[PDB]
Subunit: 382 residues, 2 copies
């Protein structure tokens, strides 16, 4: 039951002493972990390389793209620079290791996102950790410049009142969804499970309420990195999403946040592919995407129907691991609409979303092979 997962929220799982061997990483991944977070504050580049090779090993065993998020420590203290000399080193290592996502801590203003992106030079997309009062005041600029977002509540409730986090969280998730930036809720989601094999009622509520906000991602930190029960913690995350997303009241709450279309072809075809899929009862929406942009726009609409994001670029498939519901599948380059239709039907049947005769909605760009050319909605039979 590894792919599909039966839910669309993404589980982010931090690795560390309790979750670091190949067998341990394999086990989290089967238990429900989708994105692995490597924290560069501690440990050595030597130990990360073994962990990276052990995450990537999984692509061969299960034929699925993995997703690795390198977390730069930032100017932890134990008015100042966005990337410390330690970060610039750890970054260069993360890009050696073909980081799918790089995260940056303690941003306070848009110029710090810019500094990072200028160093990164397109080699990896950027996620911003929002945890400083200034970051919240500069929220619109920061969110515009970033590619993805983490509501990093641990530090946020240190430097801001802890009672200010929930409204600030609602604000970050809303706006992230509206801007189309994947957003992850973080810190203490299952804190009690560091020591106990089962969660508290308040912890399960927090996870469910992150899902109902429509967030792309829910994270575990020390519950998988350092605790006595990492496998149960990861699995409880999967169990909460499996149930909540398929229980009554889910989509109504997700739809509370309006995500209207920009005046573009891609946003128009994303919205109307979703609606068309609802109206005809389609079993899936298949999105052909060179760089992932289209898949992100469809994901933004939060369709009921399952998405499958078909890309030729193994790095895009890896990156899409963080995007709500994206379900990336690396494929060969198709060269005709006919070939796209046959590949779309066969992919939906193979992973169990459809059987011959079922409706499918295909979003694509024709003539094929170029990014930013999305212009077709095609309703086909599997």
């Amino acid at each position: 039951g590894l792919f599909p997962r039966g839910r669309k929220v993404r589980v982010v799982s931090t690795l560390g002493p309790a979750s670091s061997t190949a067998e341990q990483i394999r086990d989290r991944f089967l238990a429900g972990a989708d994105v692995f977070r490597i924290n560069m504050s501690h440990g050595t580049h030597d130990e990360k390389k073994v962990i990276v090779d052990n995450i990537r090993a999984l692509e061969k065993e299960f034929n699925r793209p993995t997703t690795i998020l390198f977390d730069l420590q930032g100017p932890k203290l134990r008015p100042l620079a966005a990337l410390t000399p330690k970060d610039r080193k750890d970054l260069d290592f993360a890009l050696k290791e073909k980081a799918d996502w790089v995260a940056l801590s303690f941003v306070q203003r848009v110029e710090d996102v810019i500094e990072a992106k200028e160093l990164i030079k397109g080699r990896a997309p950027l996620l911003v950790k929002l945890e400083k009062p200034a970051a919240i005041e500069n929220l619109e600029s920061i969110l515009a410049a970033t590619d993805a977002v983490m509501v990093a509540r641990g530090d946020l409730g240190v430097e801001c009142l802890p009672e200010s986090v929930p409204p600030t969280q609602k604000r970050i998730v809303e706006r992230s969804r509206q801007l189309g930036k994947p957003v992850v809720v973080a810190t203490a989601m299952l804190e009690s499970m560091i020591k106990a094999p089962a969660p508290t009622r308040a912890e399960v509520s927090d996870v469910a309420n992150a899902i109902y906000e429509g967030a792309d991602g829910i994270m575990l930190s020390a519950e998988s990195a350092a605790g006595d029960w990492p496998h149960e913690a990861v699995n409880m995350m999967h169990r909460i999403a499996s149930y909540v997303e398929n229980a009554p009241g889910y989509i109504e709450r997700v739809r509370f946040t309006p995500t209207p279309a920009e005046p573009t072809t891609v946003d128009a075809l994303a919205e109307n592919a979703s609606k068309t899929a609802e109206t005809v009862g389609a079993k899936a929406i298949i999105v052909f995407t060179e760089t992932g942009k289209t898949a992100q726009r469809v994901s933004r609409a939060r369709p009921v129907a399952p998405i499958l994001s078909l890309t030729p670029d193994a790095e895009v498939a890896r990156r899409l691991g963080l995007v709500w519901g994206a379900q990336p599948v690396q494929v060969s380059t198709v060269k005709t609409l006919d070939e796209a239709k046959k590949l779309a039907a066969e992919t939906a049947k193979k992973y169990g979303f459809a059987k011959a005769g079922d409706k499918l909605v295909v979003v694509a760009g024709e003539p094929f092979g170029k990014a930013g050319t999305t212009n077709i909605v095609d309703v086909i039979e599997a």
Copy 2:
């Protein structure tokens, strides 16, 4: 100051116990933000409760505020018997038998000393033991023997508790101990009485017949039977508690949040005060500050629009009960006054019933917004009009003026009701004058501010609400 008005409308239910019992302590929690005091009748003696009750009630003179006391009755305590070695290991897929033999148990057998289980448990039904840590499934049942297959193994020790999620059992929700505790609660003039082990509407009817209208009835929703029967139980009850601790044992813990969404919605639409309970600030049993998940949990109950948010051991038994109560107050003050709050509350529709009072509850709220009113003063003899206006969840704060001391206490559990006991009025002008002088005395309005008054023209008569009146203070 920070006491009345509190600066927020949700109500804090704090459980009293060893960590919060002395006069000075009970006073502290009141000031810290606690609104309803929950007295659990399962432990302790009446003589000690009487001391606590008197200590709660003493607040009324110090602060000229009505207090509110919720008495929680334990209900049935289902436990297995004892084992020869004190415990056993149950291996998956083994046969395990429950009978009425008192002989000391073993790896195959234990006494289940509750005859009522043997009258309802049948094939396919589960028994959960040790807080759901162990699951067994009935493969065979007779009036005197229950044979099970172990589905989820683990240790099983002497007189562990168990749960019967899948079938209603012919056992009263009020035990003999509960009946006696109830009479003590009513003699102590309980403002609210809390029923446990609710399975069917008949359990609520039974409880209200014993109570003979001496206090309103809150039902705790713990058991899959009660969720199946939600509508009939909600209709019959006066208030609700989402008792998550037992719900998450008897159902999947991952299924509580959608079931909490459902309970809170229907409770608002039916006009029944609803409380969210269990582990909201659980880590503060040992720590002086909460986790992020915990603060999110309290805030998400507030955004659902629930009337109340509750602490159990955090205030009853923990090391940081003052900080725990205060933290509930801090989360409510910040969230209700921060952006995003009213929109989330309004997601649950609460349309007017076809009654004069429901139409006027709605009219007043809409009128308050349009004219910029500072308060909505509600005159009420039994509390009914207060609830219906509370139900509309208006932006403008409510002041619920009642002549009756008992009504003023009970309303302490109603969202934003802000009860004030006052003198009777006999004309409209007397009501307007009393309404303006009350809004000014507590800081809601200054001379010239607009207020919306909701009242009934035959003054002094319950059920007569028929007036909305805009006035200047």
